[PDB]
Design a protein around this motif. Structure first.
Motif, PDB file in Angstrom:
ATOM      1  N   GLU A   1      26.540 -10.759  14.705  1.00 57.00           N
ATOM      2  CA  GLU A   1      27.393 -11.321  15.802  1.00 57.00           C
ATOM      3  C   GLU A   1      28.809 -10.736  15.730  1.00 57.00           C
ATOM      4  N   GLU A   2      29.322 -10.501  14.525  1.00 56.29           N
ATOM      5  CA  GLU A   2      30.717 -10.100  14.352  1.00 56.29           C
ATOM      6  C   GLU A   2      30.971  -8.683  14.849  1.00 56.29           C
ATOM      7  N   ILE A   3      29.917  -7.880  14.973  1.00 52.47           N
ATOM      8  CA  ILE A   3      30.032  -6.502  15.509  1.00 52.47           C
ATOM      9  C   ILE A   3      29.397  -6.313  16.881  1.00 52.47           C
ATOM     10  N   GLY A   4      29.135  -7.429  17.539  1.00 51.74           N
ATOM     11  CA  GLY A   4      28.659  -7.478  18.905  1.00 51.74           C
ATOM     12  C   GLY A   4      27.222  -7.763  19.270  1.00 51.74           C
ATOM     13  N   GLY A   5      26.356  -7.942  18.267  1.00 53.75           N
ATOM     14  CA  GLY A   5      25.036  -8.498  18.475  1.00 53.75           C
ATOM     15  C   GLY A   5      23.960  -7.582  19.010  1.00 53.75           C
ATOM     16  N   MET A   6      24.259  -6.292  19.157  1.00 53.89           N
ATOM     17  CA  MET A   6      23.304  -5.408  19.839  1.00 53.89           C
ATOM     18  C   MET A   6      21.998  -5.254  19.085  1.00 53.89           C
ATOM     19  N   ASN A   7      22.014  -5.484  17.763  1.00 50.42           N
ATOM     20  CA  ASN A   7      20.790  -5.393  16.967  1.00 50.42           C
ATOM     21  C   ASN A   7      20.249  -6.732  16.506  1.00 50.42           C
ATOM     22  N   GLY A   8      20.898  -7.822  16.900  1.00 48.63           N
ATOM     23  CA  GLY A   8      20.491  -9.170  16.514  1.00 48.63           C
ATOM     24  C   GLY A   8      20.100  -9.924  17.777  1.00 48.63           C
ATOM     25  N   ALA A   9      21.019 -10.738  18.276  1.00 50.31           N
ATOM     26  CA  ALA A   9      20.753 -11.532  19.440  1.00 50.31           C
ATOM     27  C   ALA A   9      20.177 -10.707  20.598  1.00 50.31           C
ATOM     28  N   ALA A  10      20.729  -9.512  20.834  1.00 51.07           N
ATOM     29  CA  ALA A  10      20.275  -8.671  21.946  1.00 51.07           C
ATOM     30  C   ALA A  10      18.789  -8.342  21.881  1.00 51.07           C
ATOM     31  N   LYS A  11      18.262  -8.214  20.653  1.00 55.89           N
ATOM     32  CA  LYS A  11      16.874  -7.883  20.369  1.00 55.89           C
ATOM     33  C   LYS A  11      15.971  -9.090  20.278  1.00 55.89           C
ATOM     34  N   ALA A  12      16.503 -10.230  19.817  1.00 54.31           N
ATOM     35  CA  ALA A  12      15.687 -11.453  19.615  1.00 54.31           C
ATOM     36  C   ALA A  12      15.525 -12.274  20.885  1.00 54.31           C
ATOM     37  N   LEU A  13      16.622 -12.403  21.652  1.00 50.22           N
ATOM     38  CA  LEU A  13      16.579 -13.276  22.841  1.00 50.22           C
ATOM     39  C   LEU A  13      15.538 -12.876  23.888  1.00 50.22           C
ATOM     40  N   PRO A  14      15.314 -11.565  24.108  1.00 46.80           N
ATOM     41  CA  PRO A  14      14.218 -11.225  25.026  1.00 46.80           C
ATOM     42  C   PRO A  14      12.840 -11.678  24.578  1.00 46.80           C
ATOM     43  N   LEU A  15      12.667 -11.974  23.293  1.00 49.08           N
ATOM     44  CA  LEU A  15      11.369 -12.392  22.732  1.00 49.08           C
ATOM     45  C   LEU A  15      11.183 -13.912  22.670  1.00 49.08           C
ATOM     46  N   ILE A  16      12.175 -14.676  23.110  1.00 45.97           N
ATOM     47  CA  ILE A  16      12.133 -16.155  22.980  1.00 45.97           C
ATOM     48  C   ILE A  16      12.388 -16.807  24.343  1.00 45.97           C
ATOM     49  N   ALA A  67      26.681 -15.706  23.047  1.00 44.86           N
ATOM     50  CA  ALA A  67      26.299 -16.361  24.314  1.00 44.86           C
ATOM     51  C   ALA A  67      26.316 -15.358  25.491  1.00 44.86           C
ATOM     52  N   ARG A  68      27.034 -14.268  25.322  1.00 45.91           N
ATOM     53  CA  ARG A  68      27.056 -13.267  26.371  1.00 45.91           C
ATOM     54  C   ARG A  68      25.682 -12.648  26.672  1.00 45.91           C
ATOM     55  N   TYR A  69      24.694 -12.858  25.807  1.00 42.70           N
ATOM     56  CA  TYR A  69      23.351 -12.367  26.006  1.00 42.70           C
ATOM     57  C   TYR A  69      22.405 -13.324  26.752  1.00 42.70           C
ATOM     58  N   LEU A  70      22.838 -14.565  26.977  1.00 47.36           N
ATOM     59  CA  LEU A  70      21.947 -15.541  27.613  1.00 47.36           C
ATOM     60  C   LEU A  70      21.538 -15.157  29.028  1.00 47.36           C
ATOM     61  N   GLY A  71      22.512 -14.829  29.860  1.00 46.90           N
ATOM     62  CA  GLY A  71      22.278 -14.559  31.288  1.00 46.90           C
ATOM     63  C   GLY A  71      21.364 -13.380  31.530  1.00 46.90           C
ATOM     64  N   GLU A  72      21.576 -12.287  30.814  1.00 50.54           N
ATOM     65  CA  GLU A  72      20.718 -11.140  31.017  1.00 50.54           C
ATOM     66  C   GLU A  72      19.285 -11.406  30.575  1.00 50.54           C
TER      67      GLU A  72
END
Lengths: 360, 360
Positions: free
Chosen positions: B139-154, B311-316
């Motif tokens: 999260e501290e470096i912008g989430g592109m490999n964490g939240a960005a990758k997990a949220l599409p799967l949930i 949270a910036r990843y929720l909408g997309e």
């Protein structure tokens, strides 16, 4: 047989081909080795020293002594690769080091050979020379490991640092240097709420404006103190308000700008803290009958230069001397760097006569 | 009660002891491994995946689904060594990650274990859970490999990013980010003759002055775009006029400031070249009866925040959710980082009730 003029241009061209920049220390070393070999192939005794990786070559009548010492350097400022391919166009030699300062190295070497050969023909030897050479490898970065180390070893009656001026101008004055670091301290904050911090770069900018007020004089010859912001550093993370900003300033002083007074005034003028990194004194040549004789022989007049040189080390060693040089049309440190070839004779003739007058 | 919250204090403290900074990827991984072992030991089925060294740990009722997803992160910003030794004093837990964001990780895991054990005692199983957890490592470096990758799967009915706000404020709006590099090119010269150059630092400073005029809007809650000069670099040698100067700026935008228009306007206004390092969109929470229920259950009000989050990843991803969290006294990213221990119950209780209501 080739003329001495042609020998000098050829040798200068050979030297140019070594990219003897400070980022290429092995090239400085190899260029000094080439010089040692040139001396050897000409029956000239030369001595090489190396201090913290900087070479200097001494070509003296005898160890520790010379009458007329010519001082020049083989290190060059950075250039693109094409400037290490020497070329002649009309009466000009083009390349990095053509005027700063490899032509001077070549000229002194050829002069030494020429006069030694004349003495040998008369049954005399290198100990009978008055002329000596000091060729150093770190003039462009202040000479701490070159001239500073070699000059204390050489008792010379008169020194010409062949690294400035022009055939009409013997340089008897060069500006000094004060390098300072200004540190401005603000207040850290998150970049998302930057109104909670005080940006130290904005503080440093306010001080820079104040500092510039002490450098307000201008005139046609730019003979006045100057200031240059050479380096700046602040921050690490893009998203923090930086609380420390540092600026490094290069101040140049005339003989009339007392450094201590100026330092005090700067400290009174800026809000940040001022540390002094280094000073270089103004060069002021000592009165000398050798200078008067050089002017008579050459037809040059005394002049002044903006840049400092290894001439800064003469006074601490109790040596007398001046700065002089051939014609480079002010193209030093530029892509257009060149030497006016015919001007070599204008330097050779008076220096050779001076050296001969100093012989026993 | 406090004895039940103490389990979260203890787990948070264990998590804090992993210096899971980005310069220590092995510690990020090890901390995720500790979490996986803790889940196994507590009879919780958990899944881990990694992308370029960034773990996502998922604790779900079933593959690809949760009712109430709690999203938190185990990576931390840098700290001195003493910040990785957790300590409790005066109702506060001190250490790096105490509030940003290991308390939330611990809170979610303890919530999940507590409710799961109650389900199992009543003859139900993990598939009957409403609660799910997403624990990421970037999260501290912008989430592109964490939240960005997990949220599409949930697929989740509602998401709470437990990484902001406070017990009295559920965050429904967060500023966006534009991070830029400005490069100004001047003209090199020697510091002895600075009038021959163009100082790229002066150019950059002049562009920064220009840039500020595009961030002139003011209001009392600072809900407007801002600009922060976070880092500046120019020069190597004090004694040259610098020909390139670089500044890095952190810009924050409201919902009113279109990022493409602002970038275009910036580029038009400054003389130098502007490169986009990254952009992060404004977060605007979708209207939801879940948010209304959370407010009712917690006694919190909806608010807005200046910083951004995963949270910036929720909408997309077509997900509805909000930002919320326990009390950290705004000490994130500081030597003073701490969590008010009594605030844990204030987060635990409403989220547990909301989740039970989603079981039904």
């Amino acid at each position: 047989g080739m003329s001495s003029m042609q020998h000098i241009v050829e040798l200068t061209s050979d030297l140019i081909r070594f990219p003897s920049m400070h980022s290429r220390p092995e090239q400085i070393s190899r260029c000094a080795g080439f010089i040692m070999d040139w001396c050897a192939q000409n029956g000239i005794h030369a001595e090489r020293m190396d201090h913290d990786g900087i070479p200097s070559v001494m070509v003296l009548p005898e160890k520790g002594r010379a009458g007329l010492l010519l001082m020049a350097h083989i290190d060059v400022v950075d250039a693109e690769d094409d400037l290490f391919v020497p070329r002649v166009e009309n009466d000009r030699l083009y390349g990095r080091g053509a005027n700063d300062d490899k032509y001077a190295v070549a000229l002194g070497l050829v002069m030494f050979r020429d006069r030694l050969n004349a003495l040998k023909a008369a049954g005399r030897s290198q100990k009978d020379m008055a002329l000596g050479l000091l060729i150093t490898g770190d003039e462009e970065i202040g000479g701490m490991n070159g001239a500073a180390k070699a000059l204390p070893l050489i008792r010379a009656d008169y020194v010409v640092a062949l690294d400035g001026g022009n055939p009409q101008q013997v340089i008897t004055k060069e500006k000094g240097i004060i390098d300072i670091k200004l540190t401005c301290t603000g207040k850290a904050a998150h970049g998302a709420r930057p109104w909670m911090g005080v940006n130290a770069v904005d503080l440093l900018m306010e001080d820079y404006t104040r500092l510039k007020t002490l450098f307000a004089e201008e005139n046609e010859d730019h003979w006045h103190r100057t200031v240059n912001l050479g380096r700046i550093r602040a921050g690490e993370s893009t998203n923090k308000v930086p609380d420390v900003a540092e600026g490094w300033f290069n101040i140049r002083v005339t003989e009339h700008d007392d450094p201590g007074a100026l330092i005090d005034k700067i400290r009174k003028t800026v809000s940040g803290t001022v540390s002094i990194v280094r000073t270089v004194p103004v060069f002021l040549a000592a009165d000398s009958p050798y200078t008067e004789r050089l002017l008579a022989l050459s037809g040059a007049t005394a002049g002044k230069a903006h840049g400092a040189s290894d001439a800064r080390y003469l006074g601490e060693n109790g040596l007398t001397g001046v700065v002089w040089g051939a014609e480079g049309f002010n193209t030093l440190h530029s892509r257009d760097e060149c030497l006016h070839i015919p001007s070599l004779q204008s330097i050779y003739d008076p220096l050779m006569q001076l050296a001969r007058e100093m012989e026993e």
